[PDB]
Amino acid sequence: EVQLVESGGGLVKPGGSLKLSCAASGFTFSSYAMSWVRQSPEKRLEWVAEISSGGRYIYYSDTVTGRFTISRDNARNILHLEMSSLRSEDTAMYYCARGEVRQRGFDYWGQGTTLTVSSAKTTAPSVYPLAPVCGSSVTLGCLVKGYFPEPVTLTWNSGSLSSGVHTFPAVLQSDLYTLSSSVTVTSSTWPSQSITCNVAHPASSTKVDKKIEPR
Amino acid sequence: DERETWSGKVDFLLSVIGFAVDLANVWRFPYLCYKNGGGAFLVPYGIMLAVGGIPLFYMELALGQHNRKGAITCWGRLVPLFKGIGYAVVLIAFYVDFYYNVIIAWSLRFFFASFTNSLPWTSCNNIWNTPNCRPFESQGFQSAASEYFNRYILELNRSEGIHDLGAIKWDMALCLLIVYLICYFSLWKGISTSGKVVWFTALFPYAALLILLIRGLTLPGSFLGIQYYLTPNFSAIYKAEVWADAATQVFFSLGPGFGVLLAYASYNKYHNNVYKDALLTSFINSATSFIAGFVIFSVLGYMAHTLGVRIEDVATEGPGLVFVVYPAAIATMPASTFWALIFFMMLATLGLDSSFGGSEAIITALSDEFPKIKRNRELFVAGLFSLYFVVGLASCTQGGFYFFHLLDRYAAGYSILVAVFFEAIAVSWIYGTNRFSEDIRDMIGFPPGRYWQVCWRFVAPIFLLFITVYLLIGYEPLTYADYVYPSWANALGWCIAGSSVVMIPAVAIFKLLSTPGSLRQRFTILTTPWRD
Amino acid sequence: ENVLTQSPAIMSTSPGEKVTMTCRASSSVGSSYLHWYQQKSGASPKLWIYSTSNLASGVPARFSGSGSGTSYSLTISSVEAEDAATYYCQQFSGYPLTFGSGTKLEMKRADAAPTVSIFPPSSEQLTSGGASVVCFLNNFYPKDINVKWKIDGSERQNGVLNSWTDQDSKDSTYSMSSTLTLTKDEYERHNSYTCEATHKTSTSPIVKSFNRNE
Ligand SMILES: CC(C)CCC[C@@H](C)[C@H]1CC[C@H]2[C@@H]3CC=C4C[C@@H](O)CC[C@]4(C)[C@H]3CC[C@]12C
Ligand SMILES: CNCCC=C1c2ccccc2CCc2ccccc21
Ligand SMILES: [Cl-]
Ligand code: NA
Ligand code: NA
């Protein structure tokens, strides 16, 4: 019954301004103090701001005070968070969580929305087919190189096969992301059949399908 | 705007306990149990306590701790329109100080009179006696303790009314002076001292009550008194008068919205758990009344058993119980002198801390509104207490009891009901329960349950109204024994009673005609709380 | 601020074990203001144990909390496989509100040697002017593993991006991908490319090689 959905969030350059939102449904929103809690990419929780049920009591963290502004709309059931002078450290998954009773903590958390604060240039990925080699099973690969920002959607054969697939999390290097995946099938299946690599980068409107060839 | 704070929690606690627990716990509650079905009376009392007194008790305490200001300023900030409530509360506290203190004056007097090997109120063969005197209470006669308190201590027999105050009892004026000397050197430095004086004035009654429970129970016929005290009669539950006495007792015994709980709490730390304080204190107050009930009636039974006096003639209420009936029994038991001295010292200390809270309500509510006196405390309260003593000399006359009785029946009785009524209305409907719950959550970490909110909004007004209506129904032109007051005495009474409440619309009218805009715009401004 | 420190950072546990993660504070916290949250992978955190000892709704009895002042702890009497998550302590005593560094539960399994496979730069990348040699090391345990690159029998230690996967939800294994990145030139100035896997499952490293003539 209780449901929170964070909206807004995306790519922002330093000094930029963005306004996050959280839609509540399933309870008397005007009776619970709401709170913004962000989570840095290293999976670390940091409380940002708290707002009382009537907006007459506001609290901010030291790293956020003077820049962010938490806001409430009890008419349309909306938790707001306007941000300004955004620094790269503000990059996190911003969660909408509620906590009326301090002796009970945050009993309900939203799905979250991602905010990335970077001066890196949005680039399209290069999709490279990884075929051996220049056995009972065969292992193929796919290299998604030099893109920004996250994420990219990688599937094999339009998502037909899921078993034997290991997609490795991206790692930033010199303002560029590189990701790779590996699929392992029965040595008979390939290259008798087709193993395709489906990479999509929404940020650059990129959709590349690569086919792996024996040579 | 960082104000002083209690130099320890217990100080605040004992201050609130002391204020709440006074002679009413002794000379009114056990009588009401007796009159209204014994143990059965605990039901309407409990329910009225659960839905009427405690919520209001709580409310004012939270209002105090939250707003950090005294009555006038607090209510002014809470609602600019109903700021006159703060004034109405302050002067009520101001009026009560004129008469309430003389009870403590009588206490010390008996304490000084008990420095003898034979208590002077035992016999009927003294200079101040009449042929109508008998050794104990009896229908158609007067008792030795009565004629002592009346013809000797009071010399009331020499006054023909309130127009005829007579001479000044200088033995009494002295006692009243001593009372204010104690009151002054407990409050002149603020809570840093008063928070300690309450360690005695609020704790001694429990020491006294204890050894009196023991002494009372060891006496023959004590259990008979326990029967008169708590023999269940649930037919009283169906009576509306019982629920009315229960309601009235709970209200006046807790004194919520009297501006003193507010004052005391204003010195608390913002994030203090005032909720636990409200509950703990409320219980201790009612628990004290219950204890005092056994204390009183164990002796009452002993009288009805080993002295051969009718229970109807001894089970009384008010000063008649503790100045006449109880000392009468004390004088018949071994080590009478010991029990006498501590009993009088008790109801003295029972009154002192209440008197402290009453005055402190005034001084605090004023320091927050007028920096002129906040800088000059000692001088102000010296002037205030001096005014008390001077006018209080009227209470020390031969017709002093007539003056006391008038103020006791007019000065604060009705006024504080219609003040606290508007208090509940302003908080729960103008300021809103939602805004108040928000405040409480910020302080103690959590909001009040739906129970307290429904009580503050719906039950509390009906509660206060059920009482105000009740006191008006049972109104009678002011009389005492055979003395009936002139018409003008009741007129002046209603003026003193009204001089309070008149502040409610007078300031509302004043601030309304002191702001710019339109009528809807004047309200909006005079409705907006200070934090805006 | 009142910084909460949780230990251990990462905890290895087999189902059936009794574990206890601790939460230490820099300043005293009231027992009614310290709470615990559980966060599964790719999910939002959930209230787990509020006010030190009280379990939130749905939370199984195997969980408990204790402590006071500046020292608190979450205990799992008998760990289940479904308890694989990260646990964060949080104080609601004073502002600003602070969470702990968190403690991550991971499952154990029999030690597995990695199946290694090496890949040469694609023709597409070479035409672009770059050359990345990729090495996959799949389904091993425990997580820590040491890859190394050799060009013409000589060790090379730059232009390499390693990336581990989080613990698999089924076989409880891990996977790492090493990627040696060169320019097309020094890639063509040599021929022999090698990566080998130093892992605890063997005293000898697992080697995979290829030459630019096969
Ligand atoms: C006379 C007999 C029957 C009852 C005696 C009641 C006495 C023992 C009770 C009643 C009120 C109580 C006090 C009121 C509350 C407090 C504040 C707390 O922080 C310390 C204990 C203290 C100071 C209590 C001590 C015990 C106490 C004095
Ligand atoms: C309930 N506590 C006892 C103190 C009560 C009052 C008092 C006593 C002395 C000086 C002041 C006051 C003022 C509060 C008040 C109002 C109406 C009736 C009694 C009292
Ligand atoms: Cl009572
Ligand atoms: Na008192
Ligand atoms: Na009382």
mmCIF file of N, CA, C and O in Angstrom, chain B residues 334-404:
data_model
loop_
_atom_site.group_PDB
_atom_site.id
_atom_site.type_symbol
_atom_site.label_atom_id
_atom_site.label_comp_id
_atom_site.label_asym_id
_atom_site.label_seq_id
_atom_site.Cartn_x
_atom_site.Cartn_y
_atom_site.Cartn_z
ATOM 1 N N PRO B 334 -1.150 9.341 72.284
ATOM 2 C CA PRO B 334 0.156 9.506 72.934
ATOM 3 C C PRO B 334 1.156 10.181 72.004
ATOM 4 O O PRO B 334 1.047 10.034 70.783
ATOM 5 N N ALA B 335 2.111 10.903 72.585
ATOM 6 C CA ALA B 335 3.060 11.716 71.830
ATOM 7 C C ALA B 335 2.316 12.683 70.919
ATOM 8 O O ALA B 335 2.738 12.934 69.788
ATOM 9 N N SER B 336 1.205 13.213 71.426
ATOM 10 C CA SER B 336 0.344 14.110 70.666
ATOM 11 C C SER B 336 1.127 15.279 70.087
ATOM 12 O O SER B 336 0.882 15.703 68.961
ATOM 13 N N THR B 337 2.078 15.780 70.864
ATOM 14 C CA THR B 337 2.859 16.938 70.471
ATOM 15 C C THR B 337 3.661 16.667 69.208
ATOM 16 O O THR B 337 3.762 17.523 68.328
ATOM 17 N N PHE B 338 4.226 15.471 69.123
ATOM 18 C CA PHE B 338 5.037 15.103 67.974
ATOM 19 C C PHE B 338 4.203 15.088 66.695
ATOM 20 O O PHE B 338 4.583 15.692 65.691
ATOM 21 N N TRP B 339 3.059 14.412 66.742
ATOM 22 C CA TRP B 339 2.180 14.333 65.581
ATOM 23 C C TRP B 339 1.660 15.711 65.193
ATOM 24 O O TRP B 339 1.539 16.026 64.011
ATOM 25 N N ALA B 340 1.364 16.533 66.194
ATOM 26 C CA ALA B 340 0.861 17.876 65.951
ATOM 27 C C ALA B 340 1.871 18.710 65.172
ATOM 28 O O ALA B 340 1.538 19.299 64.142
ATOM 29 N N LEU B 341 3.107 18.749 65.661
ATOM 30 C CA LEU B 341 4.156 19.546 65.030
ATOM 31 C C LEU B 341 4.414 19.155 63.580
ATOM 32 O O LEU B 341 4.588 20.017 62.725
ATOM 33 N N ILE B 342 4.437 17.861 63.293
ATOM 34 C CA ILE B 342 4.755 17.445 61.936
ATOM 35 C C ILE B 342 3.555 17.576 60.997
ATOM 36 O O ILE B 342 3.721 17.838 59.804
ATOM 37 N N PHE B 343 2.353 17.409 61.540
ATOM 38 C CA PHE B 343 1.134 17.563 60.751
ATOM 39 C C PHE B 343 0.989 18.995 60.260
ATOM 40 O O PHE B 343 0.627 19.235 59.108
ATOM 41 N N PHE B 344 1.271 19.946 61.140
ATOM 42 C CA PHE B 344 1.171 21.349 60.778
ATOM 43 C C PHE B 344 2.306 21.744 59.858
ATOM 44 O O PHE B 344 2.089 22.415 58.852
ATOM 45 N N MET B 345 3.515 21.305 60.185
ATOM 46 C CA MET B 345 4.662 21.535 59.313
ATOM 47 C C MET B 345 4.402 20.967 57.913
ATOM 48 O O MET B 345 4.852 21.541 56.914
ATOM 49 N N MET B 346 3.646 19.866 57.844
ATOM 50 C CA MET B 346 3.299 19.222 56.567
ATOM 51 C C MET B 346 2.435 20.119 55.663
ATOM 52 O O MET B 346 2.864 20.502 54.557
ATOM 53 N N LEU B 347 1.230 20.456 56.121
ATOM 54 C CA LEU B 347 0.337 21.264 55.300
ATOM 55 C C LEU B 347 0.853 22.682 55.083
ATOM 56 O O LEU B 347 0.342 23.408 54.229
ATOM 57 N N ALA B 348 1.869 23.067 55.851
ATOM 58 C CA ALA B 348 2.609 24.280 55.549
ATOM 59 C C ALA B 348 3.441 24.026 54.291
ATOM 60 O O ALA B 348 3.347 24.772 53.314
ATOM 61 N N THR B 349 4.235 22.957 54.307
ATOM 62 C CA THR B 349 5.047 22.596 53.147
ATOM 63 C C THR B 349 4.192 22.164 51.954
ATOM 64 O O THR B 349 4.618 22.273 50.800
ATOM 65 N N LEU B 350 2.990 21.671 52.230
ATOM 66 C CA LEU B 350 2.054 21.343 51.162
ATOM 67 C C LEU B 350 1.608 22.595 50.424
ATOM 68 O O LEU B 350 1.277 22.543 49.244
ATOM 69 N N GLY B 351 1.594 23.720 51.128
ATOM 70 C CA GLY B 351 1.128 24.961 50.546
ATOM 71 C C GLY B 351 2.245 25.772 49.924
ATOM 72 O O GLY B 351 2.056 26.385 48.874
ATOM 73 N N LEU B 352 3.406 25.769 50.571
ATOM 74 C CA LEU B 352 4.546 26.583 50.146
ATOM 75 C C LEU B 352 4.925 26.436 48.668
ATOM 76 O O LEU B 352 4.951 27.423 47.930
ATOM 77 N N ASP B 353 5.214 25.209 48.242
ATOM 78 C CA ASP B 353 5.626 24.961 46.862
ATOM 79 C C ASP B 353 4.535 25.300 45.843
ATOM 80 O O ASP B 353 4.838 25.710 44.722
ATOM 81 N N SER B 354 3.273 25.134 46.230
ATOM 82 C CA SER B 354 2.172 25.566 45.377
ATOM 83 C C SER B 354 2.222 27.075 45.239
ATOM 84 O O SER B 354 2.072 27.614 44.141
ATOM 85 N N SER B 355 2.445 27.750 46.364
ATOM 86 C CA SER B 355 2.564 29.202 46.383
ATOM 87 C C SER B 355 3.759 29.655 45.549
ATOM 88 O O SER B 355 3.696 30.686 44.875
ATOM 89 N N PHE B 356 4.839 28.878 45.599
ATOM 90 C CA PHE B 356 6.012 29.132 44.771
ATOM 91 C C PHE B 356 5.648 29.158 43.288
ATOM 92 O O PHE B 356 5.957 30.118 42.577
ATOM 93 N N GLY B 357 4.989 28.097 42.832
ATOM 94 C CA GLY B 357 4.637 27.958 41.434
ATOM 95 C C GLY B 357 3.693 29.043 40.969
ATOM 96 O O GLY B 357 3.770 29.503 39.829
ATOM 97 N N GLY B 358 2.796 29.457 41.854
ATOM 98 C CA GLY B 358 1.836 30.492 41.519
ATOM 99 C C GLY B 358 2.525 31.811 41.246
ATOM 100 O O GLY B 358 2.268 32.460 40.233
ATOM 101 N N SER B 359 3.409 32.204 42.154
ATOM 102 C CA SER B 359 4.141 33.450 42.010
ATOM 103 C C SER B 359 5.089 33.380 40.823
ATOM 104 O O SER B 359 5.177 34.321 40.033
ATOM 105 N N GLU B 360 5.789 32.255 40.694
ATOM 106 C CA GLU B 360 6.779 32.086 39.634
ATOM 107 C C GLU B 360 6.135 32.184 38.264
ATOM 108 O O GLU B 360 6.765 32.620 37.305
ATOM 109 N N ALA B 361 4.872 31.777 38.184
ATOM 110 C CA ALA B 361 4.098 31.923 36.961
ATOM 111 C C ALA B 361 4.048 33.388 36.569
ATOM 112 O O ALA B 361 4.233 33.729 35.406
ATOM 113 N N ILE B 362 3.806 34.248 37.554
ATOM 114 C CA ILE B 362 3.725 35.689 37.331
ATOM 115 C C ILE B 362 5.076 36.274 36.934
ATOM 116 O O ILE B 362 5.202 36.922 35.895
ATOM 117 N N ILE B 363 6.081 36.035 37.771
ATOM 118 C CA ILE B 363 7.413 36.583 37.559
ATOM 119 C C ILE B 363 8.008 36.161 36.218
ATOM 120 O O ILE B 363 8.597 36.979 35.509
ATOM 121 N N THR B 364 7.854 34.888 35.872
ATOM 122 C CA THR B 364 8.377 34.377 34.609
ATOM 123 C C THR B 364 7.612 34.952 33.421
ATOM 124 O O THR B 364 8.213 35.407 32.448
ATOM 125 N N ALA B 365 6.285 34.951 33.506
ATOM 126 C CA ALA B 365 5.452 35.444 32.410
ATOM 127 C C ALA B 365 5.746 36.910 32.121
ATOM 128 O O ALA B 365 5.534 37.393 31.005
ATOM 129 N N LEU B 366 6.261 37.602 33.136
ATOM 130 C CA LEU B 366 6.550 39.033 33.057
ATOM 131 C C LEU B 366 7.968 39.322 32.549
ATOM 132 O O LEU B 366 8.150 40.205 31.696
ATOM 133 N N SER B 367 8.961 38.591 33.062
ATOM 134 C CA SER B 367 10.348 38.759 32.623
ATOM 135 C C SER B 367 10.518 38.563 31.113
ATOM 136 O O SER B 367 11.374 39.197 30.479
ATOM 137 N N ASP B 368 9.682 37.697 30.546
ATOM 138 C CA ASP B 368 9.726 37.376 29.124
ATOM 139 C C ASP B 368 9.087 38.470 28.265
ATOM 140 O O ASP B 368 9.378 38.575 27.063
ATOM 141 N N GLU B 369 8.215 39.274 28.878
ATOM 142 C CA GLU B 369 7.506 40.334 28.159
ATOM 143 C C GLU B 369 8.117 41.711 28.415
ATOM 144 O O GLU B 369 8.060 42.601 27.563
ATOM 145 N N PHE B 370 8.700 41.880 29.597
ATOM 146 C CA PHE B 370 9.247 43.171 29.997
ATOM 147 C C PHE B 370 10.673 43.032 30.538
ATOM 148 O O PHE B 370 10.868 42.670 31.701
ATOM 149 N N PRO B 371 11.680 43.328 29.694
ATOM 150 C CA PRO B 371 13.093 43.216 30.085
ATOM 151 C C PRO B 371 13.437 44.137 31.254
ATOM 152 O O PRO B 371 14.435 43.922 31.942
ATOM 153 N N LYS B 372 12.598 45.146 31.473
ATOM 154 C CA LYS B 372 12.762 46.094 32.574
ATOM 155 C C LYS B 372 12.883 45.407 33.941
ATOM 156 O O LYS B 372 13.743 45.769 34.749
ATOM 157 N N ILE B 373 12.027 44.411 34.180
ATOM 158 C CA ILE B 373 12.025 43.638 35.430
ATOM 159 C C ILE B 373 12.916 42.379 35.391
ATOM 160 O O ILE B 373 13.409 41.948 36.436
ATOM 161 N N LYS B 374 13.113 41.789 34.208
ATOM 162 C CA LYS B 374 13.985 40.618 34.070
ATOM 163 C C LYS B 374 15.404 40.942 34.532
ATOM 164 O O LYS B 374 16.097 40.098 35.107
ATOM 165 N N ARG B 375 15.815 42.180 34.273
ATOM 166 C CA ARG B 375 17.065 42.725 34.781
ATOM 167 C C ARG B 375 16.985 42.980 36.290
ATOM 168 O O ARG B 375 17.993 42.899 36.990
ATOM 169 N N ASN B 376 15.781 43.284 36.778
ATOM 170 C CA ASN B 376 15.562 43.692 38.173
ATOM 171 C C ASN B 376 14.619 42.765 38.961
ATOM 172 O O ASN B 376 13.615 43.230 39.507
ATOM 173 N N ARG B 377 14.942 41.471 39.029
ATOM 174 C CA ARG B 377 14.073 40.470 39.668
ATOM 175 C C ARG B 377 13.760 40.761 41.143
ATOM 176 O O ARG B 377 12.619 41.108 41.475
ATOM 177 N N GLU B 378 14.776 40.632 42.000
ATOM 178 C CA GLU B 378 14.647 40.849 43.441
ATOM 179 C C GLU B 378 13.808 42.067 43.815
ATOM 180 O O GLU B 378 12.899 41.963 44.639
ATOM 181 N N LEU B 379 14.125 43.215 43.218
ATOM 182 C CA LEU B 379 13.363 44.437 43.446
ATOM 183 C C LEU B 379 11.887 44.246 43.096
ATOM 184 O O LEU B 379 11.009 44.643 43.863
ATOM 185 N N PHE B 380 11.615 43.632 41.947
ATOM 186 C CA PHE B 380 10.232 43.424 41.524
ATOM 187 C C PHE B 380 9.449 42.539 42.482
ATOM 188 O O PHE B 380 8.361 42.901 42.931
ATOM 189 N N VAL B 381 9.997 41.370 42.784
ATOM 190 C CA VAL B 381 9.289 40.422 43.626
ATOM 191 C C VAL B 381 9.221 40.912 45.072
ATOM 192 O O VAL B 381 8.288 40.569 45.797
ATOM 193 N N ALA B 382 10.190 41.733 45.482
ATOM 194 C CA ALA B 382 10.143 42.349 46.806
ATOM 195 C C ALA B 382 8.981 43.316 46.858
ATOM 196 O O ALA B 382 8.303 43.429 47.874
ATOM 197 N N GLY B 383 8.759 44.012 45.750
ATOM 198 C CA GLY B 383 7.645 44.929 45.646
ATOM 199 C C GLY B 383 6.341 44.168 45.584
ATOM 200 O O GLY B 383 5.343 44.581 46.174
ATOM 201 N N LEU B 384 6.355 43.044 44.873
ATOM 202 C CA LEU B 384 5.161 42.220 44.705
ATOM 203 C C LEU B 384 4.743 41.577 46.023
ATOM 204 O O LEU B 384 3.585 41.669 46.432
ATOM 205 N N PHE B 385 5.693 40.930 46.687
ATOM 206 C CA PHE B 385 5.406 40.264 47.949
ATOM 207 C C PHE B 385 5.040 41.263 49.042
ATOM 208 O O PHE B 385 4.279 40.943 49.954
ATOM 209 N N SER B 386 5.578 42.474 48.942
ATOM 210 C CA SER B 386 5.247 43.531 49.889
ATOM 211 C C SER B 386 3.792 43.936 49.722
ATOM 212 O O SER B 386 3.063 44.084 50.704
ATOM 213 N N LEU B 387 3.378 44.111 48.472
ATOM 214 C CA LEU B 387 1.976 44.356 48.156
ATOM 215 C C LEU B 387 1.097 43.229 48.705
ATOM 216 O O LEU B 387 0.016 43.480 49.241
ATOM 217 N N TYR B 388 1.573 41.992 48.580
ATOM 218 C CA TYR B 388 0.860 40.839 49.124
ATOM 219 C C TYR B 388 0.649 40.983 50.624
ATOM 220 O O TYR B 388 -0.481 40.921 51.111
ATOM 221 N N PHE B 389 1.748 41.168 51.348
ATOM 222 C CA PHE B 389 1.707 41.275 52.798
ATOM 223 C C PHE B 389 0.828 42.431 53.269
ATOM 224 O O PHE B 389 0.048 42.275 54.207
ATOM 225 N N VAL B 390 0.959 43.587 52.623
ATOM 226 C CA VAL B 390 0.185 44.765 53.012
ATOM 227 C C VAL B 390 -1.315 44.488 52.901
ATOM 228 O O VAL B 390 -2.050 44.623 53.877
ATOM 229 N N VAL B 391 -1.760 44.082 51.717
ATOM 230 C CA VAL B 391 -3.160 43.739 51.514
ATOM 231 C C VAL B 391 -3.514 42.503 52.336
ATOM 232 O O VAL B 391 -4.646 42.349 52.796
ATOM 233 N N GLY B 392 -2.528 41.633 52.540
ATOM 234 C CA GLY B 392 -2.736 40.405 53.284
ATOM 235 C C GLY B 392 -3.031 40.643 54.753
ATOM 236 O O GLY B 392 -3.454 39.730 55.470
ATOM 237 N N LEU B 393 -2.799 41.873 55.201
ATOM 238 C CA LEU B 393 -3.097 42.255 56.573
ATOM 239 C C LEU B 393 -4.601 42.213 56.802
ATOM 240 O O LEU B 393 -5.059 41.996 57.923
ATOM 241 N N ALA B 394 -5.364 42.414 55.730
ATOM 242 C CA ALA B 394 -6.816 42.286 55.786
ATOM 243 C C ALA B 394 -7.220 40.862 56.156
ATOM 244 O O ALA B 394 -8.234 40.642 56.819
ATOM 245 N N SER B 395 -6.422 39.892 55.723
ATOM 246 C CA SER B 395 -6.689 38.494 56.036
ATOM 247 C C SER B 395 -6.296 38.187 57.475
ATOM 248 O O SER B 395 -6.748 37.198 58.054
ATOM 249 N N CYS B 396 -5.460 39.045 58.052
ATOM 250 C CA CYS B 396 -4.993 38.854 59.422
ATOM 251 C C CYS B 396 -5.856 39.582 60.443
ATOM 252 O O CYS B 396 -5.544 39.594 61.633
ATOM 253 N N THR B 397 -6.943 40.186 59.976
ATOM 254 C CA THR B 397 -7.877 40.849 60.876
ATOM 255 C C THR B 397 -8.788 39.836 61.562
ATOM 256 O O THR B 397 -8.697 38.631 61.316
ATOM 257 N N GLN B 398 -9.667 40.334 62.423
ATOM 258 C CA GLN B 398 -10.616 39.482 63.125
ATOM 259 C C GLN B 398 -11.699 38.975 62.184
ATOM 260 O O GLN B 398 -12.344 37.968 62.449
ATOM 261 N N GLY B 399 -11.901 39.688 61.087
ATOM 262 C CA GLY B 399 -12.863 39.279 60.085
ATOM 263 C C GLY B 399 -12.131 38.823 58.844
ATOM 264 O O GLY B 399 -12.692 38.809 57.746
ATOM 265 N N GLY B 400 -10.867 38.454 59.032
ATOM 266 C CA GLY B 400 -10.013 38.025 57.944
ATOM 267 C C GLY B 400 -10.571 36.850 57.168
ATOM 268 O O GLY B 400 -10.417 36.781 55.947
ATOM 269 N N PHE B 401 -11.227 35.928 57.864
ATOM 270 C CA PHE B 401 -11.774 34.756 57.197
ATOM 271 C C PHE B 401 -12.829 35.137 56.166
ATOM 272 O O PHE B 401 -12.995 34.448 55.160
ATOM 273 N N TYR B 402 -13.539 36.233 56.412
ATOM 274 C CA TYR B 402 -14.563 36.698 55.482
ATOM 275 C C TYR B 402 -13.934 37.216 54.197
ATOM 276 O O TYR B 402 -14.494 37.063 53.114
ATOM 277 N N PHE B 403 -12.767 37.835 54.330
ATOM 278 C CA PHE B 403 -12.020 38.324 53.179
ATOM 279 C C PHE B 403 -11.487 37.129 52.393
ATOM 280 O O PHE B 403 -11.661 37.039 51.175
ATOM 281 N N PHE B 404 -10.848 36.207 53.110
ATOM 282 C CA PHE B 404 -10.340 34.974 52.525
ATOM 283 C C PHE B 404 -11.430 34.218 51.765
ATOM 284 O O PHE B 404 -11.220 33.789 50.630
#
